Amino acid sequence: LRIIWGTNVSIQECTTNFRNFLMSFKYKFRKILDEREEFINNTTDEELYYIKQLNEMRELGTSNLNLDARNLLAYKQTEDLYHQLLNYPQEVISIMDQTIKDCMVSLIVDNNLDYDLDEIETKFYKVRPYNVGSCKGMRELNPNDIDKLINLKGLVLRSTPVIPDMKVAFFKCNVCDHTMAVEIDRGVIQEPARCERIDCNEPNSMSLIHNRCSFADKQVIKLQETPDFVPDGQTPHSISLCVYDELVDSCRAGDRIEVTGTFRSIPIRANSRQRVLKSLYKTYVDVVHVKKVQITDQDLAKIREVAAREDLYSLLARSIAPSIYELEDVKKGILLQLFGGTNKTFTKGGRYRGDINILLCGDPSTSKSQILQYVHKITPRGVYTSGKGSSAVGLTAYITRLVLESGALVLSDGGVCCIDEFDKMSDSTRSVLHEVMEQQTISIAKAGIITTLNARSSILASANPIGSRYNPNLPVTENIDLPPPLLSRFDLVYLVLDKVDEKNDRELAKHLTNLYLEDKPDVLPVEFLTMYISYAKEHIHPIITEAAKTELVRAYVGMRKMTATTRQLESMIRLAEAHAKMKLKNVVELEDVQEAVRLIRSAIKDYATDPKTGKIDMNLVQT
Amino acid sequence: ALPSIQLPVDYNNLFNEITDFLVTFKQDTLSGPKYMAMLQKVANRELNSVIIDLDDILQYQNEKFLQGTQADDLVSAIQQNANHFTELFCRAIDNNMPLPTKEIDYKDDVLDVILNQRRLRNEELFPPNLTRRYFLYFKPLSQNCARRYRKKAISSKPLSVRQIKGDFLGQLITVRGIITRVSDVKPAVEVIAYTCDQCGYEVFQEVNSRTFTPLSECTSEECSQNQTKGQLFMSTRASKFSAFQECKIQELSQQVPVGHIPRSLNIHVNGTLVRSLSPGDIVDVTGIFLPAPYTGFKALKAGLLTETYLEAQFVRQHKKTSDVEERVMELITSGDVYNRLAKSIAPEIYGNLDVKKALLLLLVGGVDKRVGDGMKIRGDINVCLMGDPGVAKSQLLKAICKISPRGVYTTGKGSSGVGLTAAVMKDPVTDEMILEGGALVLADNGICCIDEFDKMDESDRTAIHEVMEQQTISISKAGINTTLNARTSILAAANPLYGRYNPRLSPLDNINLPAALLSRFDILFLMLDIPSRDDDEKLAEHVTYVHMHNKQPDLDFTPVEPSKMREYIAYAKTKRPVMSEAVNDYVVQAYIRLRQDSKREMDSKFSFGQATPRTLLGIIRLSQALAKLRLADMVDIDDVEEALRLVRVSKESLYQE
DNA sequence: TTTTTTTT
Ligand SMILES: Nc1ncnc2c1ncn2[C@@H]1O[C@H](COP(=O)(O)OP(=O)(O)OP(O)(O)=S)[C@@H](O)[C@H]1O
Ligand SMILES: Nc1ncnc2c1ncn2[C@@H]1O[C@H](COP(=O)(O)OP(=O)(O)OP(O)(O)=S)[C@@H](O)[C@H]1O
Ligand SMILES: [Mg+2]
Ligand SMILES: [Mg+2]
Ligand SMILES: [Zn+2]
Ligand SMILES: [Zn+2]
């Protein structure tokens, strides 16, 4: 028979059970295991999930099979195999991959489909199991956990460039030239003492020809343990997980990803010259599967239905920060920034990103920081930090080993960034931020390190007026006291004020008190909301409109006529673009421009802003 | 040439005595044998660590001597050469090891699965530690009995690092000190098993050194039987493994002689005891003190000089059930526990009972709340004390810091803002920037005391703004973009500009603080010192009694002990009450009234700053804390009015003039 | 030398 050493896990019985789990495994098994009998759909449930996946996989011709734990736990034959994998992954996964390969071969031959059986025989079919176990704190790991799949969550601190992973050794005789290939067993080579040709059998003439030898691809990624898992006692740990094969270079830095992989430990040479190994063992993990943090026709239908709703604008605005009371205009602005404008990358004149930049300067206690926390949570690529705890070097780029470290902005490139207490943040680091946001790119100029980097990301700044409470006596510009260039760089500026409105105070107190009532206290499903925003960004592409352009011209002429920098024009342009995107419009409209101007005036409180003196009438503010 | 030396010890006799003790000894005086019961749990795989209490050994020795025996004085014996005796105890445990009971845990244990298989193929063969799954340990002798007396010269007495002397090498000892740093846990092998296909034999190399060299060849018979030369392969599954961690304990400043730098000892921990320690926490540790051998070349370089380390048998913490429950119902039945505790706070200090009450409320802390939408509002409470110099403010803060189990004391000038929050050390090793937990990090789930907070730098003041309102600490310094939970409570001490308050100056001007800062505090106390002949006499009498008698004059008051307050405070903090709607209406009306007052009360003479939602949240936190003290499941309107009274008193102290 | 938090 075929059994796994030290486990009493019969490889033959394992193969038979996993085969029956491959064909004759209805998704009904999974759903019933998950109960949800009110959500069972015959087609999906009665479908042999894995057989359909294998058919679509042959159609795609890929050799990788993502696999959840629940499917194994649903099939009685493979329910035991689930625990077998949990205990002794490597062997189980190897047997399982072989079984998948054989099942594909059977499917092509059984279905007599015109397919290259050699290709499938050549296709190294693999299984990428996921959900193997409940996500456990990495710090919680202990030695006995070694040799087991450990579902893990974390943030990608950094990743190494791919490394040649020696695969099969190739030798050659130095007297008769006869060659032989030694496969790397257990990461070691057993060189032939004498020539494989007994005719020659020359001792030590067999030499390893590095170039002729076979190598694989390996990469390693540092993954930070999430703050949820770690305790207050100490800083989060990180593990340099070793990735291999296609999984290599399958994630950038700052990627909130959940990964399942076997827990691995190895010796380490105490003295490189000698074979003496330190008693303690280096520990790593081999990710068999990676989870990052397709819009189904049903999902698209829901998206378009919500788009049909007129409240879409205000509905999303409230949905992004459901707990926040009021502040609908600020919510709408940040919602637009989440949507972002259109990135018309002109072949000439450079690229023109449709980015949106919103600063929040106003009297404190206004939840601005809480709003920043929300924004960071929402954006899939979020970067939260505070100026005081932030450094310009660490913000954008940090020299290292000679090598460079990505800064906070770099970790936001293609995402949203949050800089709390932006006013407190140093003026020098402010100047650093100026050009990078202006060009959406980091320019580096240092001894031996001189280059530029992509920094296309939105920033959500939170500031406080020079006077702790915004002083209407001081002009708005004086109240903020920020560089006029920097001021222009930002697209929107909400001047939140704590006007003493007994009615509004009553209502906000009601909100907060009600929250207090429920120990654990409409709005879109944040997941569905994110899907909406994504689909809009990727598929929808707003384009300027004739009426829109005419109105923009007239509006900016008025602005400059009343200062209206050209960046103001680009700001309203990108804002109308993001509005159309919010409306799932690939074409801009006059109404988008009108909304852009309206919100521009709102955030600056232009309605209450004094026509002269640069001040704002607090009585006019919120009337 | 290795001359034999007679010594008054017979390991065979001592082993026999050990076996007799284990099988025989039971905690009958306290009450099968308790040690046999533990071994039975081990057979059940219920426990993987065994603690043999030297006090139990002493009790057994007393029983034998009273019976009359050639006692081997094991309890004393273990102290001189602990490690060999630990090995002997482990062997005895194996000898007296009971069979499994109920259901054994070898459902998938590869050892049990294959060890028998290996035997069936075969049908000490393998190292005893390979099969052994129980971590032996020794509890230190209780100093309360000190029955050794003349023998108990200082055995239990914890000794500073410098107090340690090479003579103590190879001997169990006790040390009190703070844990400077703790390494991350790492695995280590007691036994290494190689597998070679040619033999099919799984050899079992056992390693006790810091490092080892691989066998790389088969002495296994099967390869020898065929004359084949085996290519041994490491088998992690087969090889035994144990968790290891390293901790460094440093001398206490009190222990440190004047003009002498503190000394620190490296500590090795293995098995279950790993991770028991926590950095920066005072702890008393007992364990075998052993030399650390070198690598061959570094050994030749060092020669007879040897590194030394400590292997901790047991750990005792000076600070962190039913007994607790009865202890607390005692005070609960006593009643008025709130005011009783407030008075019990700072027994030295006289008066300011309202301040003590507010400090107690801060100690319990407000309920931390998280919303389904994902909102989380800081339940911690922050109070500022702004008063004329020499009014015992610093003394009060130090008293609180001592009172709270996790409290940390700090001064603005002595602490850097970066160090206060977190520091990025460029070169710990290899010039790699590393974040360092600041004083606040040390204060996590604890109270941080900041003196001369007015003298504190304004920039660092803004730095702490983030942490105090928002628990987490976000750091984007060079090479480190990270966030720290950093949940802690803040108490700040400062004095009015120009030293003391000026009635001519407005309260805000005398405060001289950013409005954002001011609001972020839940409470500010404007305690002021005015000459009052009668009050001065009373305070002087109290202080004079305190000097004459160290205990403060009883004044018909009874003060609960620190351990008791900490216990009751933990229990109360466990409550987490939920408030009611009538309270909502009351608090909403009060907040509206206060906001209207501020909206009309901008006058410098009576201007204390505009009311803010943070004020309402602080009021709610104070009410919840009051409920915690009263232990009610829900906040009561009484608590709300009490918190309002506290705030009103804080503000009116000046208005009283 | 160059870059770099951090304290002095
Ligand atoms: N409109 C609002 N809705 C809900 N909560 C609010 C609102 N305005 C203020 N708050 C609360 O007021 C508190 C202020 O928190 P912050 O986020 O620090 O305020 P802020 O606007 O960021 O001003 P800072 O940070 O002090 S400069 C939080 O507890 C918020 O929940
Ligand atoms: N009510 C009191 N009860 C007991 N001792 C008191 C009292 N008021 C003052 N003292 C003593 O008088 C001195 C007051 O100064 P300190 O306690 O050293 O610092 P403090 O100035 O009171 O507080 P600061 O301003 O934050 S340093 C201390 O020696 C106190 O012990
Ligand atoms: Mg805030
Ligand atoms: Mg003082
Ligand atoms: Zn040859
Ligand atoms: Zn062999």
Numbering used by the authors:
A (entry chain 4): 177 to 469, 500 to 607, 614 to 733, 740 to 780, 792 to 852
B (entry chain 7): 4 to 34, 60 to 151, 190 to 386, 394 to 730
Task: Recite the paper's sentences.
The replisome that replicates the eukaryotic genome consists of at least three engines: the Cdc45-MCM-GINS (CMG) helicase that separates duplex DNA at the replication fork and two DNA polymerases, one on each strand, that replicate the unwound DNA. Here, we determined a series of cryo-electron microscopy structures of a yeast replisome comprising CMG, leading-strand polymerase Polε and three accessory factors on a forked DNA. In these structures, Polε engages or disengages with the motor domains of the CMG by occupying two alternative positions, which closely correlate with the rotational movement of the single-stranded DNA around the MCM pore. During this process, the polymerase remains stably coupled to the helicase using Psf1 as a hinge.
To test this hypothesis, we performed a rigorous 3D classification focused on the C tier of the MCM ring of all replisome particles. This analysis identified six conformational states of the replisome, referred to as States I-VI, which vary in both Polε stability (Conformers I-IV) and the location of leading-strand DNA lining the MCM pore. In State V (4.5% of the total particles, 4.12 Å, equivalent to Conformer IV), the leading-strand DNA becomes disengaged with Mcm5 but is further translocated onto a surface formed by Mcm3/7/4/6 subunits. At this point, Polε becomes highly dynamic and invisible in the cryo-EM density map. However, in Conformer IV (equivalent to State V) where Polε is highly flexible, the same CTD interface appears largely disengaged, despite the domain-swapped helix of Mcm5 still packing with the CTD of Mcm2. In agreement with this observation, the measured BSA for the CTD interface of Mcm2:5 is significantly reduced from 6792 Å2 in Conformer I to 2381 Å2 in Conformer IV. Correspondingly, Polε contacting motifs on Mcm2/5/3 subunits are remodeled during the transition from Conformer I to Conformer IV, largely disrupting the binding surfaces of Polε on the motor domains of the MCM ring. Therefore, in Conformer IV, Dpb2-NTD becomes the only part connecting Polε to CMG. In State V, DNA spools onto the inner CTD surface of Mcm3/7/4/6 subunits. At this stage, the ATPase centers of Mcm7:3, Mcm4:7 and Mcm6:4, which are intimately associated with DNA, have a compacted configuration, while the other three become relaxed with Mcm2:5 showing the largest displacement. Using Mcm3-CTD as a reference for superimposing the CMGs from these two states, we observe an obvious tilt (~18°) in the State V of the MCM-CTD ring relative to that of State I.
